Amino acid sequence: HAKTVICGIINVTPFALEQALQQARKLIAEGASMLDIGGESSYVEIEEEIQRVVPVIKAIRKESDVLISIDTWKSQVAEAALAAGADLVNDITGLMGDEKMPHVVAEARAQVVIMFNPVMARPQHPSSLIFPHFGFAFTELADFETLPIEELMEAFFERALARAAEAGIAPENILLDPGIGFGLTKKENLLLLRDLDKLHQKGYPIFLGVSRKRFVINILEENGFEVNPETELGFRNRDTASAHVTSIAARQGVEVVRVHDVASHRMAVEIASAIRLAD
Ligand SMILES: Nc1nc2ncc(COP(=O)(O)O)nc2c(=O)[nH]1
């Protein structure tokens, strides 16, 4: 198959535009084949987010054919964003945050990432508590609280794929994301990573968030590596750590990774693929 695509993260901060246009150039030049544009943080939020991501999207589109993803769970944002050059929606609520999202994706003929969101699925699980609240969903949710992570993931996905099926999004336009880092424990995070092929067995490409996740940070810390992001040493170790997950991921054929440091992950992707595609 084709080697792992690197998706570089561009978070527009609430000039902000010239700064996002600058990061894009940088990531492209580092070998990003896709960029993920986010503008998060009511009609007031929908409008402010749109006025964040839309100008950025247009400007990238003026100079580049790079695949652009809109990181939004709000259908009004993804709609403005596709109308401007975006190719796909990265939905961190996996179609559960907005009932009209499926239609917006279906209507635009777009690709979509359906992330498993365990924070929505288990709002009171101790790991979820620190997370904000996603969505404008689930019933009396009482089974969820209790399921193993992989049966849990499955149930969320069952729901969300049905939502997509009814909107008529072509099955070949869907990418699944296990939701690593989101109200999952260390062990659940690692188990889901250990079992990426089970998720491949379902038949969809896998979009993976491998970058600067607290569980990898803590493996570094417990093991004598400096992890303070405000040091050169700590900053680099954190990005190298992630590149290692990309190495493992790209080797088993994960289709996309979503990442901060494109260059360290391009080194992982090249080594892992050369091995994978040996013959
Ligand atoms: N699909 C997907 N989307 C995401 N959006 C944001 C963040 C966390 O923050 P960031 O914006 O700095 O990456 N992580 C993910 C992830 O793992 N997967």
Nearest alpha carbon to residue 276 among 257, 241, 249: 249
Joined tokens for residue 177: 């994301």
> In Å, what resolution does this model reach?
2.4
Residue 205 half-sphere exposure, CB side, CA atoms within 13 Å?
18
Joined tokens for residue 242: 């992630």
**Helix, strand and coil in the chain, % to nearest 5:** 50, 15, 35
Dist CA 88 CA 72 (whole Å): 10
The residue whose C-alpha atom lies closest to atom 3 belonging to ligand 1 is 92
Residues contacting 190, CB < 8 A, separation 6+: 215
Other Cβ atoms closer than 10 A to 222: 9
Fold of 1-279: TIM Barrel (3.20.20)
With 0-12 CB in 10 A as exposed, 13-18 as middle and 19+ as buried, what is 196?
middle
Dist CA 91 CA 72 (whole Å): 6
Dist CA 145 CA 134 (whole Å): 17
Quick one: DSSP state of residue 113? E
- 260 and 212 Cβ atoms separated by less than 8 Å: yes
Nearest atom in ligand 1 to the alpha carbon of residue 210 is 17
Residues contacting 268, CB < 8 A, separation 6+: 243, 244, 246, 247, 250
Q: Tokens 């250990």 correspond to what residue?
A: 194
SS3 at position 233 = helix
SS3 at position 1 = coil
The residue whose C-alpha atom lies closest to atom 18 belonging to ligand 1 is 209
Q: Compute the distance from residue 3 Cα to the ligand 1 centre, in Å.
A: 21
The C-alpha angle 256, 257, 260, rounded to 5 degrees, equals 145
Cα separation of the two ends of the chain: 11
- 135 and 186 Cβ atoms separated by less than 8 Å: no
Q: Compute the distance from residue 115 Cα to the ligand 1 centre, in Å.
A: 10
Q: Compute the distance from residue 279 Cα to the ligand 1 centre, in Å.
A: 34
DSSP code string of 115-174 = E--HHHH-TTSTTTTTS----------TTGGGS-HHHHHHHHHHHHHHHHHHHT--GGGE
Q: Tokens 């170790």 correspond to what residue?
A: 237
Domain ranges of the chain: 1-279
DSSP H/E element including 110: none
The residue whose C-alpha atom lies closest to atom 15 belonging to ligand 1 is 209
Is 259 annotated as ligand-binding? yes
Its sign, for the CA torsion 26, 30, 34, 40, is: negative
Phi, psi for 165 (deg, rounded to 5): -60, -40
